[PDB]
């Protein structure tokens, strides 16, 4: 839940930099072996971990706009519903459970077409029922965006 | 926009971004030659800003934070950005339109004392907004990024 070995994590910050650094690479900044990098390597993502190599792109050059979705439910077995209803829907890159104002916070990929947007929020919204208020954010500009 | 092949290069590395050439060229039926300019082209237009992980934040110590800010006037929020954007434990910060202008995400110690001396450090920095909102993330169900 927590404590993770030192060269772990040293691991990890540079993979998130980084994801495509070869076993070889990366043992020699950490000055240590390519055959244990590839086990440490290995071990983090049986160990969920590392659960995706994956990519920061501009989502503006690629045509879309991203929409974050506040919600805040009557009851905590509608908002697992919710979750679970919503959790298979490609656009929807994120779901998170909070406590604060919303207890469901969403981000959605949309396309940049303000009125492909629109119809599609609509759509996405109609498979939110019993919640008590659905706040949505249309992102004009993304100024940051890291993972850790 | 991006031809037929660099979007489906985009996908396919969402999907596992350390693919060989030698696979992706498989994948997209091309030569190795060709997946080394495009992917190269992609990145310096800037389409494709890092090579990542997605990594389970609970499983490392961590946990999320979400602080959603209104501005009294719009041209505060290019202030608050600028004054927050450094920080290291904010991962991310998008200006938006709707109830809230400001939508920041922090990467948190489980810790709550630790966590509350982080927030109280950023809250900090934001001087007066009409609301702030910080909810702390119990649980991530889905994280991807596109």
Do not use: H
């Not at 993502?45 to 690629?62: S, Y």
Request: aromatic share 6%.
């Amino acid at each position: 839940m927590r404590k993770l070995d030192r060269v772990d994590m040293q691991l990890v910050k540079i993979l998130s930099e980084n994801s495509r650094l070869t076993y070889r690479e990366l043992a020699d900044i950490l000055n240590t072996t390519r055959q244990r990098i590839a086990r440490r390597i290995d071990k983090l993502k049986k160990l969920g971990i590392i659960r995706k190599f994956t990519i920061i792109p501009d989502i503006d050059k690629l045509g879309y706009m991203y929409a974050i979705v506040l919600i805040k439910s009557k009851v905590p077995s509608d908002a697992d519903k919710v979750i679970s209803e919503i959790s298979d829907i490609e656009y929807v890159k994120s779901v998170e459970k909070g406590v604060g104002r919303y207890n469901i916070i969403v981000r959605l990929l949309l396309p940049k077409d303000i009125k492909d947007a629109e119809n599609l929020i609509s759509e996405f919204l109609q498979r939110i029922k019993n919640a008590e208020n659905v706040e949505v954010i249309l992102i004009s500009e993304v100024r940051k965006f890291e993972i850790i």
